Amino acid sequence: SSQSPNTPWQGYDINTNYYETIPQTNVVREYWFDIVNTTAALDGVERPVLLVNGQFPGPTIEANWGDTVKVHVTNRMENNGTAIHFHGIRQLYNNQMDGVAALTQCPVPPNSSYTYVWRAEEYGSSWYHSHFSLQAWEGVFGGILIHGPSTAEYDHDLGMVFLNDWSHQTVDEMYQSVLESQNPPHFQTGLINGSNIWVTADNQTVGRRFQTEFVPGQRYRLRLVNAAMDTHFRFSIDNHDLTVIASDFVPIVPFTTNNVPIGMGQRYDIIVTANQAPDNYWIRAIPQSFCSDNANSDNIKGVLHYEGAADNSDPTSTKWDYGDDIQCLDFSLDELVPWLALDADIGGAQMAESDVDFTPFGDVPLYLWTMGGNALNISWKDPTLQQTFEDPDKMDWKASQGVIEAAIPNKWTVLVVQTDLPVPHPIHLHGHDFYLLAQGFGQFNPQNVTLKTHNPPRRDTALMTAATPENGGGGYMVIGFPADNPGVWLIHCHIGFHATEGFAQQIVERQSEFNTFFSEDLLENTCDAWDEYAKVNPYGHQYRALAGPYESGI
Numbered sequence: 001s002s003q004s005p006n007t008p009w010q011g012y013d014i015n016t017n018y019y020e021t022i023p024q025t026n027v028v029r030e031y032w033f034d035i036v037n038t039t040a041a042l043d044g045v046e047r048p049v050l051l052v053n054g055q056f057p058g059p060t061i062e063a064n065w066g067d068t069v070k071v072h073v074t075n076r077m078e079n080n081g082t083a084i085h086f087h088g089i090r091q092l093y094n095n096q097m098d099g100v101a102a103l104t105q106c107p108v109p110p111n112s113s114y115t116y117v118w119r120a121e122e123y124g125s126s127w128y129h130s131h132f133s134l135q136a137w138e139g140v141f142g143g144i145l146i147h148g149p150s151t152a153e154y155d156h157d158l159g160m161v162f163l164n165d166w167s168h169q170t171v172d173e174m175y176q177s178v179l180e181s182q183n184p185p186h187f188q189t190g191l192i193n194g195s196n197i198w199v200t201a202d203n204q205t206v207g208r209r210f211q212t213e214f215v216p217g218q219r220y221r222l223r224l225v226n227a228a229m230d231t232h233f234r235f236s237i238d239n240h241d242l243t244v245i246a247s248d249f250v251p252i253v254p255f256t257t258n259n260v261p262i263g264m265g266q267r268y269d270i271i272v273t274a275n276q277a278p279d280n281y282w283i284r285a286i287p288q289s290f291c292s293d294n295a296n297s298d299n300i301k302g303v304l305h306y307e308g309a310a311d312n313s314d315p316t317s318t319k320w321d322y323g324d325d326i327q328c329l330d331f332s333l334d335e336l337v338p339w340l341a342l343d344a345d346i347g348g349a350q351m352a353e354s355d356v357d358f359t360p361f362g363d364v365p366l367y368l369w370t371m372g373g374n375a376l377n378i379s380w381k382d383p384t385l386q387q388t389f390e391d392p393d394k395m396d397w398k399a400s401q402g403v404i405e406a407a408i409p410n411k412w413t414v415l416v417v418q419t420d421l422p423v424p425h426p427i428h429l430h431g432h433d434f435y436l437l438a439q440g441f442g443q444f445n446p447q448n449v450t451l452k453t454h455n456p457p458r459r460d461t462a463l464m465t466a467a468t469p470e471n472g473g474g475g476y477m478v479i480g481f482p483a484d485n486p487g488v489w490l491i492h493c494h495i496g497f498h499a500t501e502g503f504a505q506q507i508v509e510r511q512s513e514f515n516t517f518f519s520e521d522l523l524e525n526t527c528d529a530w531d532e533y534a535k536v537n538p539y540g541h542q543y544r545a546l547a548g549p550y551e552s553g554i
């Protein structure tokens with residue numbers, strides 16, 4: 001009880017192994033989420049959105065390390081199912097609460113509910129979002145903020161800072177055109193924590209920029225989350241240094257930088273000290289042009305307003321000269337050093353490789369992303385956990401199910417995700433923080449690659465980097481994780497369009513121990529409701545063909 005005195009995690013600290021030890025708080029944080037169909041004018045232009053409780057971003061789930069969180073999700077829409085995923089939450093022996101349509105549950109139909117219950121067995125910053133088709137990017141997402149230890153001190157916690165791309169047509173409206181094109185999706189603008197201005201065709205300014213206020217001398221924590229559909233950002237604040245203290249849910253040895261490159265699904269916790277002359281400073285979220293197509297890359301900005309700065313007055317500050325805003329990169333392996341030091345014990349690991357390609361299918365054609373040789377093609381109404389309940393020793397996986405088996409308790413898997421294309425992708429794994437062993441450009445060399453096993457970066461989302469066409473294209477990333485968590489775990493590109501097109505596989509982990517978590521009633525109650533919806537509403541039927549809005553299932 002000498003550690004972290006007068007905190008909810010008294011008896012534990014920054015050195016506690018949070019994979020093995022959790023504070024007991026006895027506390028349950030209970031949330032009620034209505035998923036609603038509405039409109040909003042987040043940058044001053046009205047359009048349809050799907051929201052949690054009428055808010056964008058959705059309300060923050062806030063808890064202390066070791067709490068239990070209970071989220072009652074009710075579907076108040078007409079024409080979508082829903083499922084809510086808690087990104088980066090380990091869900092240890094709790095796979096059926098992971099919120100993945102077609103894996104861990106059927107979708108929740110309109111007028112039905114699902115109660116997610118999970119343990120805060122990590123601390124730091126993340127987010128929840130729909131894991132049903134493109135719905136997260138219609139606005140169904142919000143923060144997860146779990147208080148706990150930190151690797152540097154500060155005075156004020158500003159909470160979540162979401163980074164989003166945005167357009168005035170919806171992602172669902174765009175989807176058919178995306179499917180039928182070899183060009184990446186184009187977005188018109190972006191939002192910082194759900195706000196921006198917009199310049200109209202007649203040069204009027206509508207909307208309002210994100211703004212935050214600093215007291216000179218004070219230190220502020222910002223919890224950055226990239227929730228964009230198809231944009232890799234560099235975040236910066238003119239004239240201010242940023243001290244990075246965590247990557248995803250893993251506290252790291254702090255380091256200071258002038259910008260944070262942040263991929264879709266990733267989080268970084270930063271501390272900013274108000275040590276500049278009192279003034280207004282631009283906060284910038286800049287799409288990286290190699291892998292983002294945005295009409296307004298230089299106008300996704302907010303305002304840092306010091307007390308002492310002019311009111312009603314935009315910044316005139318200059319961007320940090322950190323180089324170009326072209327490549328889509330992570331912090332390097334040597335920059336991200338987990339504070340809790342753990343080695344990747346990959347002796348005796350199972351080795352796998354999943355290639356990434358983009359291929360035409362059918363007569364239109366539709367251009368689909370494939371991972372490990374197949375575009376994922378699975379079933380909302382027949383989720384993987386139903387298949388294994390019906391047949392506990394099932395071995396007859398279809399190619400289109402994209403299965404990677406990890407049957408042996410605690411045995412490591414080393415997975416190489418590779419591509420020949422000049423296109424990078426943020427790779428996210430459910431149910432695990434993976435160990436990031438390598439990340440590179442060009443061809444993967446099985447002889448020459450060095451794997452970092454000595455306290456490598458550890459997180460839940462990392463880029464498969466790729467070279468530009470002039471440098472030959474292609475790239476790879478290599479991850480390691482032990483089979484410490486029975487369940488069916490999605491591994492996929494965190495670009496929504498890509499995952500829905502097929503860029504996803506499923507890790508079937510310790511299949512013989514699904515009894516540790518599985519509830520037939522929790523599965524079938526929702527599946528039965530979903531079937532009743534599908535009878536009366538065409539949106540209840542999954543489009544799985546090649547002349548319409550193909551849905552991979554996730």
Ligand SMILES: *[C@@H]1O[C@H](CO)[C@@H](O[C@@H]2O[C@H](CO)[C@@H](O)[C@H](O)[C@H]2NC(C)=O)[C@H](O)[C@H]1NC(C)=O
Nearest residue numbers: 057058059060145157158159160161162193212
């Ligand atoms: C970004 O938007 C979120 C969601 O509205 C804001 O969340 C608040 O965060 C603070 C600090 O953790 C909490 O006190 C509030 O309860 C949250 N409100 C919610 C979730 O409705 C967040 O403050 C915004 N970020 C900034 C920097 O303004």
Ligand SMILES: [O-][O-]
Nearest residue numbers: 085087265428
């Ligand atoms: O995050 O999926």
Ligand SMILES: [Cu+2]
Nearest residue numbers: 086087088430
């Ligand atoms: Cu996830």
Ligand SMILES: [Cu+2]
Nearest residue numbers: 425493495498
């Ligand atoms: Cu992708």
Ligand SMILES: [Cu+2]
Nearest residue numbers: 131428490492
């Ligand atoms: Cu996911």
